[PDB]
Structure formats: C-alpha cells, structure tokens
Write a protein that binds this ligand. Sequence first.
Ligand code: NAD
Length: 222
Amino acid sequence: YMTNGIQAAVVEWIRALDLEIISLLLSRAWPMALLATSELRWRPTVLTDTDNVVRLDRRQRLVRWDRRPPNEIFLDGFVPIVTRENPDWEETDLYGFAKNNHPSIFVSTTKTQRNKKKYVWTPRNANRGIVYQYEIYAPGGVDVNDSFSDASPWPNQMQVAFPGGIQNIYIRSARELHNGRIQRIWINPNFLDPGDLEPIVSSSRTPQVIWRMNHPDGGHRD
Ligand SMILES: NC(=O)c1ccc[n+]([C@@H]2O[C@H](COP(=O)([O-])OP(=O)(O)OC[C@H]3O[C@@H](n4cnc5c(N)ncnc54)[C@H](O)[C@@H]3O)[C@@H](O)[C@H]2O)c1
C-alpha cells in the first residue's frame, strides 16, 4: 500500500532518509515472537477510521495532550525529545515506545473515537493544572494497534506515532484547560486545510482566539 510515511517530520535527518531505513529503525529491536505476528503498519493514504468510514489520512482527527503552550507548539510544531543523528536502539524502537515511552524520536498522538461522540484517550492528570488538547490533521505516521494487533501493549491509547515529529501546519487548534475547565480555543492560522473537515468542537460560551508569534495570553504553563 501507499503511505506518506514521515511527511509530517520536523527533524531533518529523519526527513531526509528513505522509508525503508526509518522502518528498520522502528522494527530492528522487535523479538522473533513479535516479528512472526506483527508488521510495521504505516497509516495508508486512504484508511478506515474509528467509525468504519473510509477517509484520507489527513482527515483522521488525531489529538495530543500536552502542557506546553501555543507559543511553543504552533511556532516549532511538535519536536521529539531525542533529535540527535545517532540515537540508541531504545530511543528508536516502536514497541518500547508503545510499552514504556522513555525519551524517544516519536511524538505520541491518539485517534478521535468518532463512534463514541468524538471521545479520545485522556491521561489521568488532564484535569490538574494547565493542560492543552491539540487537534492534529497530519499525513503519515505509524498506527500502533494495527502494527502489533493482539500484542499491542496499551491498545486503549489508540496510538499513532510520528518519528521525527509533527509540523505546525498539521495542527489546527488547541483547547486550553485550567483544572479540567475550558478557557479558550486557540486557532492556528498556518494550518494547511485539506477540506471536508468538521467544525472545531466549541460551545457558544467558549471564546475562540487566532494565534500569532509571541501572543500575550499564549504562553500559560505550570
Ligand atoms: N501525548 C498524548 O496525548 C498521548 C497520546 C497517546 C498516548 N500517550 C502516552 O501517554 C504517556 C505520556 O506521553 P507524553 O506525550 O506526555 O510523553 P512525552 O515524551 O511526549 O513527553 C513527556 C514530557 O516532556 C515534555 N516534552 C515533550 N517533548 C518535549 C520537547 N521537545 N521539549 C521539551 N519538553 C518536551 C512533554 O510536555 C511532557 O511533559 C506515554 O506513555 C504515551 O505513550 C500520550
């Protein structure tokens, strides 16, 4: 099948490499028992979504929970923790990323479960402090559950991994939560719109704000 692969990556050395080389780095540490049953499943250009409707990869609504504010995220995109050119095998492994998540080349996201009224996997401390729920509409990425199947360590997370990061042009919006209570919905003006996307999930009470570089209210964190 055809896949955009690492089109969303912000790290330059991952962006330059061939998909077979990046695929090797993700799968090289997999045990023989895992290799027998599992395959490295990149999200295809046309995929079956969580509500069993066939959509393009860029129309699958992904989400990333993060405590960093819009002034970081809409400026730089999502940069992974490990960006160096010669990482360890633990830092490039998809299975260890899925199982443990120690500092790695991947940026984790979760799929919108559209069969359950746009539910997403929520971390336990989402309602503590200042937290942002970033809305992502990106190409490529590695589907974790499709890859490992029954051997997927935490399938409730519904992970789509992005080795080398996610560019800021694929992030549409961000819901600013203060102790699990919505304050604002940030709008990314540099979002490359693929068309046919549903409206941003918002009440009449919640004020929507268009972001710019060094926004006055756009750098709130713990
Ligand atoms: N982020 C999500 O919404 C999401 C989605 C699905 C699964 N998970 C799982 O939940 C757990 C938590 O993941 P996570 O996303 O918080 O882990 P992470 O490695 O992305 O980051 C851990 C901490 O580092 C910060 N951080 C990340 N990249 C940074 C950078 N470049 N510079 C500075 N700080 C940076 C994050 O804000 C966070 O506080 C993992 O097991 C992950 O697999 C998370």
